Amino acid sequence: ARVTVQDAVEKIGNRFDLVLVAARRARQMQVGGKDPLVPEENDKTTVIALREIEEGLINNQILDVRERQEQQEQ
Amino acid sequence: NQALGKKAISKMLNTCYRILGLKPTVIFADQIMYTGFAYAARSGASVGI
Numbered sequence: 001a002r003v004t005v006q007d008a009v010e011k012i013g014n015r016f017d018l019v020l021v022a023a024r025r026a027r028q029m030q031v032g033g034k035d036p037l038v039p040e041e042n043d044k045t046t047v048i049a050l051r052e053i054e055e056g057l058i059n060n061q062i063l064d065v066r067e068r069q070e071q072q073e074q
Numbered sequence: 075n076q077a078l079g080k081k082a083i084s085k086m087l088n089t090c091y092r093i094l095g096l097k098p099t100v101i102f103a104d105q106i107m108y109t110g111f112a113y114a115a116r117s118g119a120s121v122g123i
Contacts, residue, residue, distance in 0.1 A: 006096040 002047050008054045025049035025058055
């Protein structure tokens with residue numbers, strides 16, 4: 001549980017863009033076709049996306065290059 | 075090392091925020107609230123005539 005998102009804020013500093021990035025990651029992991037890269041503690045995909053961003057494994061550029069890789073795969 | 079009269083408390087919280095960050099000041103605020111409540115109840119200050 002991420003009670004404070006200060007570290008996630010400072011990783012990619014806008015307090016406005018991280019909402020977009022986390023929303024995109026949560027949509028990917030909730031609609032289907034994705035699996036978390038961090039251990040799941042039976043919490044909702046929102047804090048899982050936020051924890052993913054906090055660890056540094058997901059941002060806008062990484063998501064875009066992954067999307068390009070899957071588009072090239074298909 | 076003061077009396078902490080509603081103005082030293084604010085200054086201490088402000089220094090904690092401006093020195094450490096956001097999570098430590100949140101935990102500090104919660105701890106301050108809890109210890110204040112407990113010791114105010116323990117003192118039992120009352121207003122008589």
